[model samples]
Target: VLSEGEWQLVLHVWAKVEADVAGHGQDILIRLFKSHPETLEKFDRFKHLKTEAEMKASEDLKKQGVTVLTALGAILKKKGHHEAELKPLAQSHATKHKIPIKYLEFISEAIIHVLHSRHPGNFGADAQGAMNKALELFRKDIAAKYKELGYQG
Candidate 1:
């Protein structure tokens, strides 16, 4: 759970990035795929990408990228202050896709890098820490469901 100040900082930072959610989404995923090439197999659309240029040019990749940000939109807005806007999203990934929760860890690190690199001024230490905390909260929530579903991988 996020503290009151953390909630404020993350929501404020999310407002700045939300304006270009799609762009930020693609950028974040690209960095993830580039840095952790093993993760690309998680998305069939992205699995074929061999180069960063191919990744950037991918329309399917772009569309799927938006989907991830859409999930984050709920997490940022809720983060267990409310319950389970992300239930279907997390359940789907945990079951059908069999995605490991560690993917959230990977993507969040990429998100921190992308968000901070673009606007360092907006993401000071406090803001960055808040966002990181918020993302961990999101990951743990998803992981709870994964554990319930018996996802050892």
Candidate 2:
């Protein structure tokens, strides 16, 4: 595990990537896990792991998410699919968090605060705009997925 300072730095880096790269941060995290498989077990998705058929289904969706995020990384690198990258995740986050889409606005703001401190730059507005856009696209698709699964919000 990284020291607290180191962890904060990692999150800061991720938040920067989240704003600058939008759809590829998770992919980078997954590649980082490849060289360090132990870290995959640390991603928040693992906490939802299960074994029975019903639970396994959930796990499968989460695993698919991992792959999707990886593909998104490639997309951000300009080497893979170029369409509909983060549309799904935004919706999923809304369903998962059971909250309004506006919450992403708050998350983007927080991420910007974390990032601005790292460099003496005014990234707040840029970060907010990018993040909100990502979440809007994400929620639109994720909402479709939830509807397919019979989840109403």
Candidate 3:
């Protein structure tokens, strides 16, 4: 459950970042990888990139970034609606992708970092707290499904 102000902040920030989805999404992924190098092992295509520039240049990376940001935008747009959007992704990540809960936590942290870096003045502590709460809801939704699957880890 997000406050009206938190919803506004998320939508506004997303609007600014959506203009350069490829670039911003790439940056987010880069930051995610930087913070957790082990995540690269999950992506066969991205695993070989030796530098940030290489990752930026790869078309696959660009498309992946776009896809991720687009999905996130869709979820953000569904604010106040329902979390039906996150269910399948939760299952896929937990089952097929086999992404650990810790990595999800890191991704949320990376997203907050990206949002803050992009909007240094606008995204202050209150906005950060809102994001944290909203993402906690997201994690809880996902974890619920993972638990249903007998996922202990």
Candidate 4:
């Protein structure tokens, strides 16, 4: 389960990302799309919601898209709501390409780094006092989620 603050942060980032994507934000969207093809599918769901009046909104649609999907995925993963989705992702290469478990761990970390770099301003203290509190909540959320999932190793 998401902490109240982290959940708020997740929603805030998601809204920002949606607005950004509606504006046709390009670069960030491009990278995010390239990195996480699954996210592109969600973007398709929201892209049509833009109206002419909202077309020129002052945000990058693409960057917003990347941040939103990634954050959403993380939140879901923490909450254990998408273990089915993640299990395949985390285990796929090992089953198909015969990649070692160690390599899989490394790849996961690298991907996370890419996410942080691609969405620099997506997580931090803003006018809303969100960053610190959300992080604390997220830490707890993750710990509880993992424990519930039997991750005692």
Candidate 5:
């Protein structure tokens, strides 16, 4: 749960980032793959790509990135009232994609990097803390859904 001031700071930065959601989101996914190449193996379409540049240029990757960021944006808008909203995504990734919690945890790094790069000095500890807490909430929801499927991972 974010304090009022923290929520304000987060929402303000989010509004700025959401202005170009696709590009930011694509960049985030690109960074994720770059930092954790093995994670790409889960995506059949992206796993064949020979280079990072190819993956970055992929329309399919871009679309999925946009989808992820859009879902995140919606979740942020809901503050802590997002479990119902996250259900489908959590279940889908767990059941269909078999995405492990590690990949989900990496999203925080991507988001923090994006926010810091986008806002520089303005996105400091307060905003980072809020984002981390928010991501934690998301993680818990996803993990719970995954466990409900009897997955030990």
Candidate 6:
């Protein structure tokens, strides 16, 4: 658990982040798709995007980007028992929805690049460390749950 100081540090950034959910959200997906091109097939709406302009133009991308961002936002805001909160979505995303685990992994990578982009210095080590404690447990929790939920190869 984050001490009060560390938790405040995390939510301080979140206050800033909450204001631009779609902005950063869209970019995260865009960045992820570029490097993890093969992951594109996961979304039928997104698979046919052959041009940069087209990718950004899609209604699906915009809505879905915002949706997932908001989903993550919900999770991030959970300072206590996020694990309790995690179970339902984790169940849905696994064999139920068949969302590949690495796509989630790739999104985590993109999230870092995003924070490093526009805000630059906004999320410093203090902020990063606080959330890192929470998220590591989340990953640990989610992965083991993935297997428990029968997430397939």
| TM-scores of the models, in the order given | 0.93, 0.33, 0.91, 0.33, 0.92, 0.84
lDDT (Cα, tens digit) per residue for candidate 5, span 1-153: 677777677788888888888888888888887888887888887788768689778999888888988898898888878878878887778788888888888877888888888876558888788777778877887788789877654
lDDT of 2 by residue, 1-153 (tens): 223443334334444454644233333333333434443444465534332233234544445545644543433333122345544554554455454334433333443443455443423454444434443444455456556655563
Which candidate number maximizes TM-score? 1
lDDT tens readout by residue for model 6, 1-153: 667787677667667667887777778788888879877777877799986677788878988888887776677777645777678878987866677766777777777667757654667766677756655656667888888888852
Candidate 3 residue 95 Cα shift, in angstroms, is 1.3
Model 2 ranges off by over 4 Å: 1-109, 119-124
**lDDT of all predictions:** 0.81, 0.42, 0.81, 0.43, 0.81, 0.74
User: Against the correct fold, how does model 1 do in TM-score?
Assistant: 0.93
Regions of model 6 farther than 4 Å from truth: none
Q: lDDT, candidate 4, residue 75?
A: 50
Clashes of 3: 0
Check candidate 6 and list the clashing pairs. none
Model 3's TM-score against the true structure: 0.91
Please identify which of the two predictions, 1 or 4, would achieve the higher TM-score against the true structure: 1
As for TM-score, the candidate ahead, 3 or 6, is 3
Please give the lDDT score at residue 116 for candidate 6: 58
Summing lDDT over every window of 10 consecutive residues in candidate 5, give the lowest-scoring window.
144-153
Candidate 3 vs candidate 4, lDDT winner? 3
Q: Please identify model 5 stretches exceeding 4 Å from their true place.
A: none
Quote the lDDT for 58 in model 2.
Answer: 56
| Number of clashes recorded per candidate | 0, 5, 0, 8, 0, 0
